[PDB]
Amino acid sequence: LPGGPVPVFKKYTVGSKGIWEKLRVLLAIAPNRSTGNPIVPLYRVPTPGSRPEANVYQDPSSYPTNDIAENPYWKRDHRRAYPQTAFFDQKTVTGLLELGSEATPRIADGEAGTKALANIANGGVSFTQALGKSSKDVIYGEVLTVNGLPPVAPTLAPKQWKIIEGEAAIYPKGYPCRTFH
Amino acid sequence: PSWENIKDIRLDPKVHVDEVYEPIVNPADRYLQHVSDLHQYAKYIMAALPKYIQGFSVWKDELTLHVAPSAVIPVTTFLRDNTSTQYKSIIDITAVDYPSRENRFEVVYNFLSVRHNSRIRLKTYATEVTPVPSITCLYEGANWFEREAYDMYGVFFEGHPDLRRIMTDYGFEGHPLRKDFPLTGYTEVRWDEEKRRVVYEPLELTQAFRNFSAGSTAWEPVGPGRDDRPDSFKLPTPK
Amino acid sequence: GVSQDLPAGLLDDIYMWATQFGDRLDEIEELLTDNRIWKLRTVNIGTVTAQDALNLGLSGPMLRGSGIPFDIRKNAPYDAYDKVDFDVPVGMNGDCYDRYLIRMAEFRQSLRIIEQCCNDMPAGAVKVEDFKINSPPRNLMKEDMEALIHHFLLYTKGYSVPPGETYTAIEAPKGEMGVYVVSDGSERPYKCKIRAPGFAHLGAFDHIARGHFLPDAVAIIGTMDLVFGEVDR
Amino acid sequence: SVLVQMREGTPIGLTGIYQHPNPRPALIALYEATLKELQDKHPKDSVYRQSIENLTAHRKQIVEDNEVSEVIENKIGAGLIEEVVIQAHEELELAKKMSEWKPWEELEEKPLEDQWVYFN
Amino acid sequence: NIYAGGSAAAAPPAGFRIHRPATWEESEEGALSKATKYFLLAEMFRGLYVVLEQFFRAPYTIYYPFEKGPVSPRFRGEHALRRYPSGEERCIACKLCEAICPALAITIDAEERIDGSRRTTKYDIDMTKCIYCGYCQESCPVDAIVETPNVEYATETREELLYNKEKLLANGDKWELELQYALDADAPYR
Amino acid sequence: AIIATAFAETVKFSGSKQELQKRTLALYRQFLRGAPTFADLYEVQFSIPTIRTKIRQEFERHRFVDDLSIQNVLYAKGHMEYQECINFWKQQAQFLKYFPEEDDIQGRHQPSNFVDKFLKNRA
Amino acid sequence: PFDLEISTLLPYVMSIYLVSNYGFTIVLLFLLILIIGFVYEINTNALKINTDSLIYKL
């Protein structure tokens, strides 16, 4: 089982040698536990002020961003292509109810369409009248779901939980703490 | 089999790449389908409470409902309690001082629905003399947040059982997060030897506050952006 | 991103420490997990129900102790929390002892994640590669005109944030930490409110601690894990 | 009367919520009551009523078709059956309050023109 | 299938309901063994043994001020103003350090030196406002202000903590060698 | 739950002025009654009649405020202050802020006409 | 009282041999009589210092 016990000689900690090692193994609660002291020749050596890699470091970059010949900055200028905040008041939701949408229109052409947009944008129809005139097809498709149920609060990344039991759990069976993955 | 012969990691062969490839992607693109879903959801909510919801806004993954102060109790109850919403956790409550509006403060509520893994934001407005209905009757956690909103801004919360300063000194005059309250306050304290007690005195700084905001840019920095509205939420054009 | 890239010998030293942190944890657990005095001070102290946990605004271990599996690292995968493998411990009794067990297992999960990142650290830049946001490397700043201009402006005026607002929360060690920042299009935020988990916890103190003894109040404060820089900002 | 939440007995994993003895009949009773409240005090046109009717009918069909709790909660998709009973009770109370609040009307407070202008 | 106010992710995981707690009669251990553990304090003796084992391990202490804890090139201590090898100052009064300083610690004045150079006539740091963040050092385009690895400069009155130009230059002259160590070590990473 | 504390009154904006003046007079009576408690708590040098005089001045300052909402706010703040004083939340330092007159004479020169103000650049 | 009970055994332990198997029995009876009061103390729990269901009327 990965993450299980590893012996004390694969841990970078000083420990004991000679007869004292055998004494320690005889007298230790768990013989594979390290002492906490880092190994002086190995740990934090060479010192940070004398690393050889300092004299070779170069600033890191990633293609195609570092290219000298094909990247115009405005093609990768993400700050200024930021999504606008979309504000919808009751007049706009009305307009959506009656005249349909850009994706699926329910509007006539010519002056009729523009005048319909106008008199909704003036207040000719209220939201409640909008809902009342609204047919079954439009209510079910465009307010509720196609089955007539309301939409559930959306989630960006749905998380499916699984419970780990047995040897792979953190705690054994008795403890009041379970492992969710 | 012992620590004196433990293998030196420092001399192991490290991985080496020659060129790193990171494609150029706009981070807002990942939210498109979810923005459509939030739009549909907000449409449903407005249709369900046309008496209360004055409008919504959607930005990436954050949905906001704008309501009048009288609409707060009904809308909060509907959010907390409807099966499709279930916004059981109050996250925070705050105010934002807009001195240009007739109603200065706008009160913001964030809710969290552990059932559905979804969040929502609800806004209202208030003034220095008109209060907002307290939602402590619905969410217990809102007690302290409303005491903080009052302390910082002065917004009153009608029906709050125990509304008093939570942060500022005892006997502090002024609501510090108001845009007209100066940075350094009006008073300071020191120990007074004659009186043997900490006394309050008009502010006097040894070095004056240097406001470097005078060097703000003289050129508009970002521009208009782009709209991520789904085609199912834009009014149709005739022909 | 981050201000500077890692020094040259850091991954090895982190791994060397990680080889023995497991034992360092086991020793604390030897003193604490089974001690009957510890369980006397922690079992059924500061009990909080699931529903009241949600109602009070509690998050983190204070919420996972009551049985609800909610973790922003798993729910709203931010940063590289989706590229790494780890489990989430969830209590069932919502008392000081379950929260202690939760924290003790979060130690182990953190050690696992640290090892995974030690093994999978990739190459490339550490800060976003647009010098209109983050300053350019000093070898460019001293040779290139554009880089020098951008460095000058970034450290004198600052970058301008598009107007808008956001509430962004992460799974801070103490629970859910979030910020609500209001941007007005300028270089200085219009409004910044920090949601500190300790604030909500200390708010729930009076509900949790009623009917207990004074030492139980001490233990409760301990399990809320308050810092008080968070509480008042 | 309907037993909504057991506050003692067998814990189920969530603190404060214990195993419900006879959950399915309590779900059925709550669904009947909420349907009845919608039909007697909510206008047939309102989207609130239509939505809640469809949702309650769906859940009630699922509870009546299935006898085993785990199958029911898998099909409902909203937590353990105890939590489902609490959800049904809560929806029921919300419907009774909505009767008095009357949200289907036109909105009483319009915002001023300056109310929702941000810096964009 | 189709969900109403729910979803597959909101459905309980397999096995979310916990098993019923066991009664006393369904216990594997005899009452006598449990009573042995109860009366002889088994786990308390295990704790005492773990504690006693530490008593025979190497302690962690170091003997300050004869030894010192680790220090890295990037460390941020007291401030110092650097010179060019020719001994001309490096600070050209560009005042970016003044503009970035998050604590408003830095106060600078400047004017044309008699030989025409752009130099400072007053450069103060209030070491009691500073938060030792090192922005001033990232900002300066000529590496003039730097933060030495020195932390031992505690004073007996506050007026000694208001550094003027003369003091900061003296610090630079005094610590130049160590500053060169830290620079040689970290400059590729800035 | 989180229960209110001692002498806590839920926030309620009176819809009518008269119902507000009832509460206002109750609050004034509470302050007058608490005066000796304040004198014990905060170890004040001055007398209980001086506490009561100060309270009367404080209530006097808003005697001609008309708009109801402003009166509601002033009453709420006055009650918050009363709760602050009576529960010993306040310390002596903040309490004596209310009492700037009973401190001794600050100096020889407190200017009153234009010439003395002008001499001190305060004209 | 318990202090007095404990200190009433001092004469016994200083005279155990002289009182032989007689005093032995007497001090057993004394101890058992006191043990009865100790049992009373235990069973009365003398030194020791919201679970309703939620029912809706449909």
Ligand SMILES: CCCCCCCCCCCCCCCCCC(=O)OC[C@H](COP(=O)(O)OCCN)OC(=O)CCCCCCCCCCCCCCCCC
């Ligand atoms: C099997 C047949 C046996 C027949 C009878 C045996 C004859 C007498 C046995 C000798 C020891 C008896 C004295 C200790 C008994 C321990 C009892 C105990 O555990 O106390 C429990 C008490 C709470 O009581 P309780 O409610 O019953 O616990 C259940 C909680 N859910 O909570 C407690 O008080 C915790 C225990 C107190 C321990 C005190 C520790 C302080 C000093 C540590 C001593 C260790 C030795 C130190 C010496 C150094 C080591 C060399």
Ligand code: SF4
């Ligand atoms: S360290 Fe920070 S606070 Fe101090 S002078 Fe530099 S920028 Fe200013």
Ligand code: SF4
């Ligand atoms: S940033 Fe550097 S060069 Fe510019 S004024 Fe400050 S110390 Fe001098």
